[PDB]
Amino acid sequence: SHENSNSATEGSTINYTTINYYKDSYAATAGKQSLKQDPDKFANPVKDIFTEMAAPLK
Amino acid sequence: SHENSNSATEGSTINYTTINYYKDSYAATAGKQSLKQDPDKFANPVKDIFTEMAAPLK
Amino acid sequence: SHENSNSATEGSTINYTTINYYKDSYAATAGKQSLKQDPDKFANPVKDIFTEMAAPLK
Amino acid sequence: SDRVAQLTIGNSTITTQEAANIIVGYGEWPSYCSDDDATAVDKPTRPDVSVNRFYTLDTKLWEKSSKGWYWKFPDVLTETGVFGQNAQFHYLYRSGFCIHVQCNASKFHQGALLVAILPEYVIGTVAGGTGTEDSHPPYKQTQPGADGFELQHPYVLDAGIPISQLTVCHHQRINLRTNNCATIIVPYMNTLPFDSALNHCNFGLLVVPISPLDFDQGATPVIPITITLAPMCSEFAGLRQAVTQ
Amino acid sequence: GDRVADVIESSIGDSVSRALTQALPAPTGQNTQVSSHRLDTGEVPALQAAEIGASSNTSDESMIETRCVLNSHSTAETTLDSFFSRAGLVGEIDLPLEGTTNPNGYANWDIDITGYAQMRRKVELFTYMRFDAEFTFVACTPTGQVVPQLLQYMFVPPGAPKPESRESLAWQTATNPSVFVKLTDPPAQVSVPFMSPASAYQWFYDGYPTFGEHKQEKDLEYGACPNNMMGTFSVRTVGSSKSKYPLVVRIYMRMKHVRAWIPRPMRNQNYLFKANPNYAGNSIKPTGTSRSAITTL
Amino acid sequence: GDRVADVIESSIGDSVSRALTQALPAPTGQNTQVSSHRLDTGEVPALQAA
Ligand SMILES: CCCCCCCCCCCCC/C=C/[C@H](O)[C@H](N)CO
Structure with missing residues (x-):
């Protein structure tokens, strides 16, 4: 399908599989997102990472 | 697609990618124009072209 | 497309390019006729053909 | 190397020492119509040096309270010279132009x-x-x-x-x-390859004073503006009798 | 052959267009290079001559100290197809019941897109255009209501006899393209090709189409270009007797495969007539707005 | 390191003194060369700008 590439995702690490019947890519369906998580961003945002086997403050 | 070639573009340097469901090519969609500009036609229409590093009238 | 061949053209020197969605070929579209002319049939229907450079009756 | 210029075409010559540059209309030079663009089936005549020459039209008077003038082309050249006598006899017409407006002070x-x-x-x-x-x-x-x-x-x-x-x-x-001079080379701008030269005027020249004139008492008070123009690559097709309009 | 020397070494018959420009691909905007301070002599990129006629070629790097910016702004919005392919109202046809405008159930409309001021100002930016079309006919009552009524649109090419009335024998459309719609469906939509004898349309045609002594009676033919008179649009209520529902037809045209030549200034005054660039003589309104002084805002 | 382009291609931190002159040894005074009559155009060694 030869179309324009101007959706609100372009330039990301997530690869879609959508259907589209027009020339512009913001009219396409939502599709199947890739399942990539990152718990280390909001839950463990510390500089030195400590092991769970050790007490942190010694 | 075997059809007639009688659109209002034929014989140009712009190559389209359109869809069409009839035998004549003026009923097709607008499509994706090629992006070719020419600023030297309306902005610098002079015979001898001068460099921007040099004053023109010396 | 496996269909019947029973249109009102079959057995001619003109080759069509039509679309059809039924089993019989008289329901198809009009399509693109071949462009073959014959001016020598109604305009110069004479037995001995004379050149345009020469007067015919001498 | 850029202030001075000379325009030699035909048997006429314009020399000026306070010129700016010779602009080219839309990046296209005037030329003759090719075999693809041509519609007629008769051979077009083309006088080479008898019509491609400068015609000094008229002298205007740029006073203090001037507003502007306009000349419709090619209406100005139907009574001057061999060009003014070919456009009265012929039907089709095709030419570029080369307009040069002198105004000195x-x-x-x-x-x-x-x-x-x-x-x-x-x-x-x-x-x-x-x-x-x-x-x-x-x-x-x-x-x-x-x-x-x-x-x-x-x-x-x-x-x-x-x-x-x-x-x-x-x-x-x-x-x-x-x-002190403005020189413009205009190509042939029309939807048709040829055109009638008695009703359709292709383009109009506009000379309007934006910044007004000013001088003190003692200088000479009249400043004239003269238009000088030359057709280029003129062509004509289709003979008939001489009709004026 | 040729034996004279002033023809074999001449240039009479140059047919190719010797172009000084060459169109380059430009999908995005232009980037900016890194520039440092420069305090040299002779090389000045800020001083030009507006008397030459060409515009400014001053880069941003030759005037200030810039930073490297990888610009990725697409210029795919300002093209001709992305500017004109928006359907605007170009005409309105009335069909009343009891009146003097069209009391016989039919109305004839000449084809011109210069009847409404919002579409007219866009297409008169250029001088020559060359486009296809997609017409759209939305029919409704003057109160917006949709009634079960059958209508026939007919495209009359220039030359064909116009219908004198509703029961006339020109409505039998043996070769004219006609559209039969009701009102309880989506509106009709056709595709009109480039139907001109010339190579492009023209909205401004300076001159007369006829010959002869142009006096005060024949002055209204000025500017009437016959490469644009495309015919007549006709509607009727498909039937014999008098109908009982009033109708209003609206026409929406969008251009596709657009090529345009020779731009020109856009109009700033009010329009007054169709295919006639008249203006108000006493009420000449300036383009911008006025303030008290120039030294302050 | 560096990843921006307006610093890796910049000139901030020029420490060396970019001199236009270069001291030459001169133990004695300068000699004088033989010169003849010269009646040319354009080349003027007597006209300057103070
Ligand atoms: C059922 C058929 C629908 C009617 C289709 C009409 C086709 C006519 C082509 C429209 C293209 C615009 C014509 C432009 C001409 C301008 O009005 C004149 N230059 C100015 O009056």
Whole structure:
């Protein structure tokens, strides 16, 4: 399908599989997102990472 | 697609990618124009072209 | 497309390019006729053909 | 190497030492119509050096309270020379142009001019002032001849379009501080390969003083503007008798 | 052959267009290079001559100290197809019941897109255009209501006899393209090709189409270009007797495969007539707005 | 390191003194060369700008 590439995702690490019947890519369906998580961003945002086997403050 | 070639573009340097469901090519969609500009036609229409590093009238 | 061949053209020197969605070929579209002319049939229907450079009756 | 120039074409020659540059209309030189663009089946005649030469039209008077003038092309060249006698006999017509407007002053005068080429400059009238009557311009105002016509409302160019956007077309400026001449080479601009030369005027030349003239008491008070133009790659097709209009 | 020397070494008959410009691909905007301070002599990129006629070629790097910016702004919005392919109202046809405008159930409309001021100002930016079309006919009552009524649109090419009335024998459309719609469906939509004898349309045609002594009676033919008179649009209520529902037809045209030549200034004054660039003589309104002084805002 | 382009291609931190002159050894005074009559155009060694 030869179309324009101007959706609100372009330039990301997530690869879609959508259907589209027009020339512009913001009219396409939502599709199947890739399942990539990152718990280390909001839950463990510390500089030195400590092991769970050790007490942190010694 | 075997059809007639009688659109209002034929014989140009712009190559389209359109869809069409009839035998004549003026009923097709607008499509994706090629992006070719020419600023030297309306902005610098002079015979001898001068460099921007040099004053023109010396 | 496996269909019947029973249109009102079959057995001619003109080759069509039509679309059809039924089993019989008289329901198809009009399509693109071949462009073959014959001016020598109604305009110069004479037995001995004379050149345009020469007067015919001498 | 750039201030001085010379235009030699035909048996005429224009030499100027305070020129700016020779602009080229839309990056296209005037040429002859190819076999793809041609519609007619008769061979077109083409006088080489007898029509491609300069014709000095008329002398205007740039006073203090001037507004502007306009000349419709090629209406100005139907009574001058062999070109004015070929366009009366022939039907089809095809030519570029080369327009050169001289306007001189001393180093104590100040002022500017705008020399514009407006294709299919359609004259519109004021519709009776209030805009009720469906009036139309007369024949002595639409095609004025070689004497031009003074603009009545130059801010709207007597056509409804404003003057401040006129420089999107071909423009050179006669500023009496640096230069004194404006030279424009116009190609053939029409939807048809040939055209009639008695009714359709291709483009209109516009000379309007943007910055006014000024001088002190003691200099000479009259400053003239002269138009000089030469057709280029002229062609004609289709003979008949001489009809004037 | 040729034996003279002023023809074999001549240039008479140059047919190719010797172009000084060459169109380059430009999908995005232009980037900016890194520039440092420069305090040299002779090389000045800020001083030009507006008397030449060409515009400014001053880069941003030759005037200030810039930073490297990888610009990725697409210029795919300002093209001709992305500017004109928006359907605007170009005409309206009335069909009343008891009146003097069209009391016989039919109305004839000449084809011109210069009847409404919002579409007219866009297409008169250029002088020559060359486009296809997609017409759209939305029919409704003057109160917006949709009634079960059958209608026939007919495209009359220039030359064909116009219908004198509703029961006339020109409505039998043996070769004219006609559209039969009701009102309880989506509106009709056709595709009109480039139907001109010339190579492009023209909205401004300076001159007369006829010959002869142009006097005060024949002055209204000025500017009437016959490469644009495309015919007549006709509607009727398909039937014999008098109908009982009033109708209003609206026409919406969008251009596709657009090529345009020779730009020109856009109009700033009010329009007054169709295919006639007249303006108000006393009420000349300036383009911008006025303030008290120039030294202050 | 560096990843921006307006610093890796910049000139901030020029420490060396970019001199236009270069001291030459001169133990004695300068000699004088033989010169003949010269009646040319354009080349003027007597006209300057103070
Ligand atoms: C059922 C058929 C629908 C009617 C289709 C009409 C086709 C006519 C082509 C439309 C293209 C625009 C014509 C432009 C001409 C301008 O009005 C004149 N230059 C100015 O009056």
